[PDB]
Ligand binder design. Structure first.
Ligand SMILES: [Zn+2]
Length: 257
């Protein structure tokens, strides 16, 4: 099955998922000088006041913090979007060392990690229908750099010991994803895809300019997770990022100058 290794990683995905070589794949390098400032782009509206986290899951690739998406409680709107997108989960991608881990790059710079908050367009009724549509998902991407600790991350870090291995989950209620946001909501945006299989070309990407800072200790706890299941040979969960893909016939727009 697919993964991040030599034998099943990004360079192999196209064999089971041909859309890997498609026209709107993600992530991409963001060339800051080429990105067009678009004064028509609206401020991002992030309304997470009523977010209901339920559970955290080690799915063998990363960990997902899941939300109750059975009502409009945690939604993304505005920005480049038309209509309302409901938060379903967030997860991260990270490296074996602090010099790699992000999926998007900025002028070829790699950050230590990247957070993806995944939302689906309510006009399609459910996530599985939304991913079949070119405007089905809005993913908010946030870079992580290593420096000061992120206090709002610590609850996530401290549950990871209980989901070390693939297929482990744990109750994870009352977590507030607002604590993972940077000060500014300035962004870049472009049409793309899921960054892991099935690689569906259904995402409006919204990548924030301002990274969050996490501590070295925080990131080191990410790197103690396992890709393998309980009892299986230990393979540390590191380098679970897809590299930048060709931009092809796409324009990256900036909300800011
Ligand atoms: Zn992701």
């Amino acid at each position: 099955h697919w993964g991040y290794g030599k034998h099943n990683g990004p360079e192999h995905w196209h064999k089971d998922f041909p859309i890997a070589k498609g026209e709107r794949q993600s992530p991409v390098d963001i060339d800051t000088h080429t990105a067009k400032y678009d004064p028509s782009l609206k401020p991002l509206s992030v309304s997470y006041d009523q977010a209901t986290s339920l559970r955290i899951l080690n799915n063998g690739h990363a960990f997902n913090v899941e939300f109750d998406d059975s009502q409009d409680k945690a939604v993304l709107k505005g920005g480049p979007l038309d209509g309302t997108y409901r938060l379903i989960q967030f997860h991260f991608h990270w490296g074996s060392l602090d010099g790699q881990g992000s999926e998007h790059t900025v002028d070829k710079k790699k950050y230590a990690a990247e957070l993806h908050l995944v939302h689906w367009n309510t006009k399609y009724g459910d996530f599985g229908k939304a991913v079949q549509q070119p405007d089905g998902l809005a993913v908010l991407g946030i870079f992580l750099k290593v420096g000061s600790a992120k206090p709002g991350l610590q609850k996530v870090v401290d549950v990871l010991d209980s989901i070390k291995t693939k297929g482990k989950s744990a109750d994870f209620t009352n977590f507030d994803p607002r604590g993972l946001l940077p000060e500014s909501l300035d962004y870049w945006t472009y049409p793309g895809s899921l960054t892991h299989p099935p690689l569906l070309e259904c995402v409006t990407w919204i990548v924030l300019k301002e990274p969050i800072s996490v501590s070295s200790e925080q990131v080191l706890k990410f790197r103690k997770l396992n890709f393998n299941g309980e009892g299986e040979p230990e393979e540390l969960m590191v380098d679970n990022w897809r590299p930048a893909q060709p931009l092809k016939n796409r324009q990256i727009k900036a909300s800011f100058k």
